[PDB]
Design a protein around this ligand. Structure first.
Ligand code: NAD
Ligand code: NAD
Ligand code: NAD
Ligand code: NAD
Lengths: 298, 311, 299, 306
């Protein structure tokens, strides 16, 4: 019963948003991507408009406004990280609430600036933090309600990844922000507010550091280099995900959309800590570990 | 075992080519597409190089030549239709056989120019004509040849395939990129009709727009009335809402019944498969249709969907 | 003193707009082009911001609104023809008046739609018709107006503009971006004829293709036989001839255009409607055989 | 008489190459740029082919090879810095000598790679080092070489105003431009080598996306240098009068200060500058790009660093 536009519609994650919109009984009425290979749209929302240039998308969305039945209600955003800010800004200024992929924006300063536009427009920004709706993360949050937290995320990526916008630091904002953000969000959701934040290693392939919460001591390691795979996993799974609490090794998008639509979306105030966390990590100066704070893989 | 590069790797058909290369026991060593949303490749060929600019692709391919174990053997092409010609030229000039999607190229003159490059480079161009490998099509071709009845088959071909608004905003909607309905949407149906029914003798067009076209073909063994559309509105009454695509091909009133990209690759790799001389017939057919001056339908030659046009 | 944005800033005609803004005493504060090869801007307005993506230009322009000192007054548009419409729409919706190159838009329906936005936004669209400022066109307009013959002037117009291989590889060679010969090549000539000779009564086309066209226009004051081509084969790298009763017409205007807009004397949708209707008709016309000697001699 | 192609033909520096081709009596037969706003070509080479996609440019250039009268002889390159390498490689592999803008490439390993390609293709790469052609630099080189027991004290300052657009362009992307020292400074470092010999020490004091400064010691010179695209760095007397300030002082004395057409004449006369000539300045900027900043000592700071 609500009308959505989808920006980034031809990319990897966009079909999950297309599916969420359909599965909550809603309508994708406009889609925009600078690449035109988007035919998957016909299998889900065959009557959607499509645009490859933002000028034409924006004019169409503005014309829809003239009729309360046709007007957009939401703009969903799955574009590259650096474009989230102006896509959100335009979405709010169209008179829409906005649903945006993580990382939401790179800096707390940008959050303050979007909160300005929220107030000017009377509209709201929501962020996909889908791990929070997950039954095991809540349980551990419920359960925790100072733990020994060790986090490894190593996800094999082929040569294409560094040739994509995901490998351009100015478009992606780096490993911590692009690959780690929702894992930092998760650690705050379980183990409260951050008190210390130190970085031991950083490259285009990988990153490693120490985070101290009210309730957790967290050592962390992120990588897109297959060679970081433990001997024990090479040859089998392309991804090694290991989160232990004191030693104990611990769809969602449609759910995320459900919560947003019911008025329980995650907004700027909710996204703020993790944006702060990764922003510090991005600019932080590397320092040799101590106190056994440095991830074992370092 | 053989080394492949893939041009157009981020698009819709590309994963069929990646699967064909893997399933035939070969290796995709390099891929190129101007769009970088190509992560599907990791699920099939995790070790492939990837480029978004032709200049870097070409330097890498050239470096691979230095060692006979690493040199490319084939360049597969799934780019937009207008880019087939230069992609093929480049592939042959890199010292590779070339596998290219249909429509191969839009004109017979361009086929002649490609055959020159094959002679110069001593490499060969193959075209994907995957329906030729289909059992039912093979069966009907053989049913037709052995029956050698004295009357032509009466064939009605209708293929209406719903396209949303994105399709006409894409290259497939730019006539200078796609080369139009008959060439982009119809070429493999025309080739199938040739493969089964022999040489084309007459080629007439009754209607042509960016959405749809209709005409009449006469082959040695068939009279074919045809209609092609990407307009959902042309879907017959019974099919609408229930299904996006309507494909009907009747032969003397009876409806025809019918991993073919993998089979295509097997056949090429087995010393068979289809070159310029095989693709030539269909390219001539669509070249004529694309540039045809429309004529009024005579003689019961109009497909039933054009019945109300000026005559 | 007025704040300008310029869209299409890295292109061929753009520096005339940059110089017009500077020379009238105003300020280019924002510029946007998908191509970043824009260094010329330093030599005319060293202080302009620049953007390569519409997303970023639009956010910046919106933010400028928050202070009346920094807010944009005008958005000037030098983009390819098919982009004029959405660029104009966005400009008006940012709260700016809009100055757009010819051809303004391809159809009168689009003019109606833009007049709707003018009313929604309380802003105005102006079109560059800079030939209207040329002394020779003004003198002929005044001569036609003063002379009292009941018989129309007989005008033959020929314009053949050939260019190198790059031209047809550009958006100017894509009929879906350019809108074709009458519209991209002819529009300012049809405007000039209207400006000098009054209302168009009859508009007929004798030949048309993606490369040349020819037809016959009858105005209140003139019978006009016209031929336009980008094909150098047609040359008798440019030939321009406008004859009035057998006599040859004898011939920075963009800075003048800007002075006139800033003076409240710009040409709006009502003024550009005539040439847009003329070219719209020509673009989709069904050809007719030339009769009554209405055929340009080149056909 | 020689046939040229020009890659990057729609850009800022391109028309200087078009003029060099024309004024040495040669023919620009093909041009390629991803942007189509290139009509300046008609004023100089109205018969040139033009392409916006490399695939079509390459096919056309390969077809020209069929007839020795139409075959390309040279490919000239003025594309963004990161594309110099693959453009040069394609040029040599088409059977053409290549003329490439500075910075030639960013690393000495890339130079070694391009020399392999020279050897495989039997063609040559030449580079635009146009300050060597400057009467005033040639004079100082030989002045310096006939004399002196002592080094020359040199301060080099180059400040060239760039507005907001510059860092929005490829010139502002480190992975496309290779940074200020490399993009803006490389032909100065070459000049200093040309005149004062081998580099002994290379120290960097400041680096940002707008400017840089450091200290180079050569066999015959101690050189304090400062480069900037920030108009605020201009000396007060120049602000408002000119957008560029270029100063090279040698023992406190100001050096006494079309070069594209000259560079082309030299290359066509067999006196072009190759990989071996460009290697020194490529090494110098490669070091600067990767250097850890150190405080200035022993008065080695350029005054503008302060
Ligand atoms: N929540 C999750 O679990 C999850 C998983 C993957 C990605 N993501 C996030 O989703 C976003 C998309 O990532 P992706 O993996 O789908 O990458 P992607 O590169 O496959 O898709 C990005 C899409 O953006 C399009 N695009 C580029 N510039 C554009 C513009 N100016 N306007 C409109 N579209 C433009 C590209 O053409 C592409 O189709 C990123 O922010 C990423 O961090 C989230
Ligand atoms: N055999 C069949 O039955 C069949 C089925 C579908 C498509 N096709 C053919 O396959 C080809 C691709 O069709 P598609 O449906 O996958 O379209 P598509 O638009 O999804 O894919 C095209 C790919 O080409 C890339 N591309 C554009 N310009 C390029 C360039 N200069 N270099 C490299 N890549 C470039 C695009 O980014 C896109 O990823 C067409 O020729 C089409 O006719 C054949
Ligand atoms: N008044 C006159 O006499 C006159 C003369 C020449 C051109 N024109 C008109 O001026 C316009 C420009 O013509 P031109 O000759 O300068 O062509 P051009 O191709 O040299 O310049 C066009 C510019 O638009 C930029 N561009 C493309 N898409 C864009 C987008 N989405 N947003 C922003 N910029 C984009 C292009 O990169 C380019 O720099 C056309 O409408 C043309 O008809 C008028
Ligand atoms: N010798 C000198 O004193 C001097 C002076 C200025 C520039 N330069 C050098 O000249 C080169 C060009 O600089 P510029 O200032 O003219 O920049 P520019 O951005 O104005 O020109 C770059 C051109 O390259 C084109 N381009 C981008 N990608 C391309 C591709 N894949 N293929 C073909 N063309 C492509 C761009 O569209 C543009 O027209 C750089 O290496 C620069 O360092 C040298």
């Amino acid at each position: 019963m609500k009308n959505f536009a989808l920006i980034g519609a031809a990319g990897y994650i966009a079909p999950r948003h297309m599916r969420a919109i359909k599965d909550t009984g809603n309508c994708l009425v406009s889609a925009y991507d600078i690449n035109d290979s988007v035919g998957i749209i016909d299998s889900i929302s065959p009557q959607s408009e499509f645009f490859t240039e933002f000028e034409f998308f924006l004019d169409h969305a503005s014309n829809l406004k003239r009729d309360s039945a046709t007007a957009l209600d939401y703009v969903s955003i799955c574009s590259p990280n650096y474009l989230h800010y102006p896509h959100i800004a335009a979405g709010l200024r169209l008179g829409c609430d906005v649903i945006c992929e993580k990382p939401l924006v790179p800096t707390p300063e940008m959050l303050d600036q979007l909160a300005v536009i929220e107030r000017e427009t009377d509209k709201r920004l929501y962020n996909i933090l889908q791990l929070r709706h997950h039954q095991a993360i809540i349980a551990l949050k419920d359960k925790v309600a100072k733990y020994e937290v060790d986090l490894t995320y190593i996800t094999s990526r082929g040569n294409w990844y560094l040739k994509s916008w995901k490998g351009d630091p100015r478009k992606s904002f780096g490993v911590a922000t692009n690959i780690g953000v929702h894992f930092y969000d998760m650690l705050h959701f379980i183990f409260g507010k951050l008190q210390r934040n130190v970085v031991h290693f950083t490259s285009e392939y990988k990153t490693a550091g120490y985070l101290e919460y009210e309730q957790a001591r967290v050592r962390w390691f992120l990588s897109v280099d297959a060679n970081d795979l433990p001997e024990s996993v090479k040859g089998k799974k392309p991804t090694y995900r290991s989160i232990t609490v004191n030693g104990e090794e611990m769809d969602l998008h449609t759910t995320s959309y459900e919560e947003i639509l019911a008025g329980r979306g995650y907004g700027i105030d909710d996204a703020r800590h993790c944006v702060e966390t990764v922003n510090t990590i991005r600019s932080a100066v590397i320092v040799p570990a101590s106190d056994n704070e440095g991830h074992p893989f370092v």
